[PDB]
Design a protein around this nucleic acid. Sequence first.
RNA 1: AGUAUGAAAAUGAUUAUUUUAUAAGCAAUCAUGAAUAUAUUAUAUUAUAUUAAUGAUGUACCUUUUGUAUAAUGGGUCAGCAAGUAAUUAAUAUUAGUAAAACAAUAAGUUAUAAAUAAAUAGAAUAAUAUAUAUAUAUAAAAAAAUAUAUAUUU
RNA 2: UAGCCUUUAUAAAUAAUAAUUAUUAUAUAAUAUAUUAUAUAAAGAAUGGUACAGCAAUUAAUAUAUAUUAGGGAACUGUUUUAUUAAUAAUAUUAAAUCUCGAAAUAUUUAAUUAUAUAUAAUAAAGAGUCAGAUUAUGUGCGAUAAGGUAAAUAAUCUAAAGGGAAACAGCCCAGAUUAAGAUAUAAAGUUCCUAAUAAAUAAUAAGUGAAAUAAAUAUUAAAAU
RNA 3: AAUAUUUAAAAUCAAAUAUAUAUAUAUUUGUUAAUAGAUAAUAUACGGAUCUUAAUAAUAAGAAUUAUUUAAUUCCUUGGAAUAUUAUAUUUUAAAAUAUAAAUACUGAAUAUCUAAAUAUUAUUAUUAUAAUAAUAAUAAUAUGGUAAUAGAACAUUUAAUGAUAAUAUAUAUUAGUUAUUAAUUAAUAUAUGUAUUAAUUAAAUAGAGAA
RNA 4: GAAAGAAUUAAAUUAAUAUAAUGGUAUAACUGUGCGAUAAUUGUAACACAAACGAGUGAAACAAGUACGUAAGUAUGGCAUAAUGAACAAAUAACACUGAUUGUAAAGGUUAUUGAUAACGAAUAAAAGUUACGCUAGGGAAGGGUAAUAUAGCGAAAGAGUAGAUAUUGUAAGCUAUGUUUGCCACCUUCGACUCAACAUUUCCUCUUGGUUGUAAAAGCUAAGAAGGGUU
Lengths: 82, 119
Amino acid sequence: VFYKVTLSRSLIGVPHTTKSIVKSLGLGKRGSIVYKKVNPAIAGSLAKVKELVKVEVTEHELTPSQQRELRKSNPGFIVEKR
Amino acid sequence: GGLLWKIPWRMSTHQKTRQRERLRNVDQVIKQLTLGLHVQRCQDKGLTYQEAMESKKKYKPRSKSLRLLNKPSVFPKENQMSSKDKYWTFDKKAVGYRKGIHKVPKWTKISIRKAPKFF
RNA sequence: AGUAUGAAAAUGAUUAUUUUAUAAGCAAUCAUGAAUAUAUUAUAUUAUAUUAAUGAUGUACCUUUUGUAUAAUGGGUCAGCAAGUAAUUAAUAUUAGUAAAACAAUAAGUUAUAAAUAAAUAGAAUAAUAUAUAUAUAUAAAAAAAUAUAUAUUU
RNA sequence: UAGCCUUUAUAAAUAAUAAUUAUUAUAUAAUAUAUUAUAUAAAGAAUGGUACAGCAAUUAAUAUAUAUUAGGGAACUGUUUUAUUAAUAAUAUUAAAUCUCGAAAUAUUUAAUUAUAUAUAAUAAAGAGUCAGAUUAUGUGCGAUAAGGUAAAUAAUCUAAAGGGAAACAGCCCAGAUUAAGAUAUAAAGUUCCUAAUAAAUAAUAAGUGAAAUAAAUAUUAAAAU
RNA sequence: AAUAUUUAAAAUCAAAUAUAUAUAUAUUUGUUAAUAGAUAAUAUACGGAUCUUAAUAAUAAGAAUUAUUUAAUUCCUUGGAAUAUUAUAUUUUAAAAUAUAAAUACUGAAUAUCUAAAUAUUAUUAUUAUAAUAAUAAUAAUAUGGUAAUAGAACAUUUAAUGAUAAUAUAUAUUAGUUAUUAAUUAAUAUAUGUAUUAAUUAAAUAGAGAA
RNA sequence: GAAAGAAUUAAAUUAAUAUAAUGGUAUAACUGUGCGAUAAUUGUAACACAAACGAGUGAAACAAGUACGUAAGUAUGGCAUAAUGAACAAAUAACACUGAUUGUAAAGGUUAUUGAUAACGAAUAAAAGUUACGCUAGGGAAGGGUAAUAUAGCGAAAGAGUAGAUAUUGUAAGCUAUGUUUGCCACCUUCGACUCAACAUUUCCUCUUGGUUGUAAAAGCUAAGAAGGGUU
Ligand SMILES: [Mg+2]
Ligand SMILES: [Mg+2]
Ligand SMILES: [Mg+2]
Ligand SMILES: [Mg+2]
Ligand SMILES: [Mg+2]
Ligand SMILES: [Mg+2]
Ligand SMILES: [Mg+2]
Ligand SMILES: [Mg+2]
Ligand SMILES: [Mg+2]
Ligand SMILES: [Mg+2]
Ligand SMILES: [Mg+2]
Ligand SMILES: [Mg+2]
Ligand SMILES: [Mg+2]
Ligand SMILES: [Mg+2]
Ligand SMILES: [Mg+2]
Ligand SMILES: [Mg+2]
Ligand SMILES: [Mg+2]
Ligand SMILES: [Mg+2]
Ligand SMILES: [Mg+2]
Ligand SMILES: [Mg+2]
Ligand SMILES: [Mg+2]
Ligand SMILES: [Mg+2]
Ligand SMILES: [Mg+2]
Ligand SMILES: [Mg+2]
Ligand SMILES: [Mg+2]
Ligand SMILES: [Mg+2]
Ligand SMILES: [Mg+2]
Ligand SMILES: [Mg+2]
Ligand SMILES: [Mg+2]
Ligand SMILES: [Mg+2]
Ligand SMILES: [Mg+2]
Ligand SMILES: [Mg+2]
Ligand SMILES: [Mg+2]
Ligand SMILES: [Mg+2]
Ligand SMILES: [Mg+2]
Ligand SMILES: [Mg+2]
Ligand SMILES: [Mg+2]
Ligand SMILES: [Mg+2]
Ligand SMILES: [Mg+2]
Ligand SMILES: [Mg+2]
Ligand SMILES: [Mg+2]
Ligand SMILES: [Mg+2]
Ligand SMILES: [Mg+2]
């Protein structure tokens, strides 16, 4: 299974050591989402930044394209040509 | 100390609610980290995701950090901490040997759960 | 300090529209009534333009400073003028020409083509990749330390 | 000059960052007191001597109708004893920047694996600027456990950082401005009005104590437990 | 009741949780309040107003202080069920019964997402004409505060080389529009000129001023 | 059962180490003894620690010779960390490297050694003061913070007070308040007199009151409310 990791809090005031831990996890700007294969190595890294992130276990992995298509809003119309 | 840093010595009721929420979120992160390890190990043994979640046996973590973070003595859960430890920290240069938690830099992010037994 | 033109600004008087005699601060931005002016498609329940009703936000600019609204320096205003340029050399990067040669031709010179040593008459596979060879210290010669040279076409 | 920044590139480049496995023990099963697999517990490979803790040796302090040596008066009546005092011995109790017999977390750091490759290191050729810093939090030297004081150590921000919050606010809590819009989540902080947003539960206060900068020894009143 | 101590979850007691599981072990949590003391100079200073509740009685108030909490309260373990509740519709006699909605509290930045646009880069496509290319447009992802400083690309003025057109034009100024706009353009108005060192590519600067 | 030997175990680094302090040392790095006087030698020194450069530290390995040891092997000074100084110009010797027309030479070069710049990365071989008569370019490269001190109060009461700590007085130590004196930090570069005063009360007088075996009366001491008027 996979971990769904969200950078809830920002890295403005965190020490550079914590910043390095987060950067090596693939997380970028605040609110970024990355799907990490569950692994004792990953669990340790998330344990050290347990505050700044929010972690939920998920069955499958969503590619970034899949996430975008799931994030698009619903236009309230179907265009009729002419 | 001419410059005025008007930081009060007590928190408002709303800061306390947020502090309790932040502690719970951290505990939930730990609870989820262990859950993934248990599910991953169970899948390795051959089980599927569903039965892994319903398995009576829950594989406890083996890493030192996660094993200790799951010990209430070392890292107590929000429902287990005392009110003093939730909102007050330990300073050895303060009257009462305690100071408001909000005075700790980056208190919102940093986690201070344990205080000396008699202080 | 030539001659013509001169709706360039600062500056003064007057007129026209709007606002202003119970309201307080970089004089603006946004929100929003009202009045006025123009409009040869205002068909209008219209569009623009001007204007301190009223509400919210708003601590001039530059220099020097850890730090300036600062009661730190400079500025009455407007117009004109006011500051990384040239010569002789050297080293790097891109492109272009030519190319184991190039510039230049009259010769001469310069650079590259062989690396070293303070210097000297020394200077690269005797049969292949450093275990070979050249130079410097040493020696009878090697080893040792440093740099350089070679695996149809010399770089 | 080094340190921190910038431009262009090199592959036989992942060498960068981050974490995990390492270790000890218990229980079950298989194999020949031992090995293997599985689960669990333990601050969990190697280095260290701070906090803590302690009085080991060193440096200091206290008390014993305890014992010995010596000093001195009295008693005895010159003897021994007594009155004692200093030292040592024994027992018990303490502390320290230059004490650590015990000892953390952080920290230094190693091989492999995994994840970051719209990412790191290293290297080659060329350019700078900087060498007056400030505050907050923590552990200290000086000061008086004074200073918006001074000197260093670690982290963050300002310096060079818009925005929200602390009335106002360089340094505090959030959160980093490509340009729009404004639907939805929101961080810190708030919801009687000024001012965008609220309803509740259980106790205490009668002092406007308090309500966004807690003023102490002590006295009075009252409340629980022994 | 009187008297003398302490104000404590260490010990004990209560409760919760993890293991062997009707019990035991281990871990965690739970132990007073008010007043006086109280202190200076332009002016009261929680930012201000102001905040403590009251039956007869209002559609309706009763901290806006301190302490521990919730998102109506309770059971299972973020979610499910039940029960006090508000509002409405139907039926019956201002009241009774059935049915439906509310259990994410709300505000909150230039945060994040969504909705569009721009530049750069990585990876895929389409149209047009080092075609392994150039221009333009699409989809996914990442980035776009910034002083000293570094690097890239453009605009205004003047001079030199090349350089049609022309009063139905050119230059300048005002006003109102257009182009993602320090610029150039459309129209109207005013003045000069039978007329661009004009468009565009190069080469040079006495090449840009609220700062001495 | 006894004698001797090899020795083992515990304690010890407090003694000793050329020299300060620290770390190490009994497997001794400490001590005694034989040989010795040798490695207190000679050309290449990779690689590391440290590090801006200059410099500094450990040292594998190749080659020549020496001392000890039967041999294995050890020795490139001292158990380790301090015991130091760049160039320039001069001086001495060795090498045979240049030799300004040629041969010599002169002079330079390589190698080894010498002398102190202690302001100790050393500006020259060689240098002290005064300025209120001064000058130029710059920076500040009484307010504010603190309250040791000062003033005042509070808590407790040793002791005076003919008697009795608390009528009055109140050692030394304790907890505070003000920023009115002397200080400290560097964010920030005129004392007195005349005239007019405004404000505070921690009240000098005037008004009310409590205590005063130390209120007989009058004068007084101490304290509470009080800033309206006055205070040469
Ligand atoms: Mg009016
Ligand atoms: Mg005015
Ligand atoms: Mg200054
Ligand atoms: Mg300011
Ligand atoms: Mg000024
Ligand atoms: Mg002014
Ligand atoms: Mg001026
Ligand atoms: Mg530099
Ligand atoms: Mg690796
Ligand atoms: Mg120490
Ligand atoms: Mg020890
Ligand atoms: Mg400095
Ligand atoms: Mg300071
Ligand atoms: Mg600066
Ligand atoms: Mg800011
Ligand atoms: Mg920053
Ligand atoms: Mg940004
Ligand atoms: Mg109050
Ligand atoms: Mg407020
Ligand atoms: Mg307990
Ligand atoms: Mg006041
Ligand atoms: Mg954004
Ligand atoms: Mg930028
Ligand atoms: Mg000019
Ligand atoms: Mg000008
Ligand atoms: Mg300008
Ligand atoms: Mg010695
Ligand atoms: Mg010693
Ligand atoms: Mg190093
Ligand atoms: Mg070096
Ligand atoms: Mg010796
Ligand atoms: Mg000299
Ligand atoms: Mg010769
Ligand atoms: Mg000659
Ligand atoms: Mg000679
Ligand atoms: Mg001198
Ligand atoms: Mg004189
Ligand atoms: Mg002062
Ligand atoms: Mg007495
Ligand atoms: Mg006294
Ligand atoms: Mg008074
Ligand atoms: Mg009288
Ligand atoms: Mg009166």
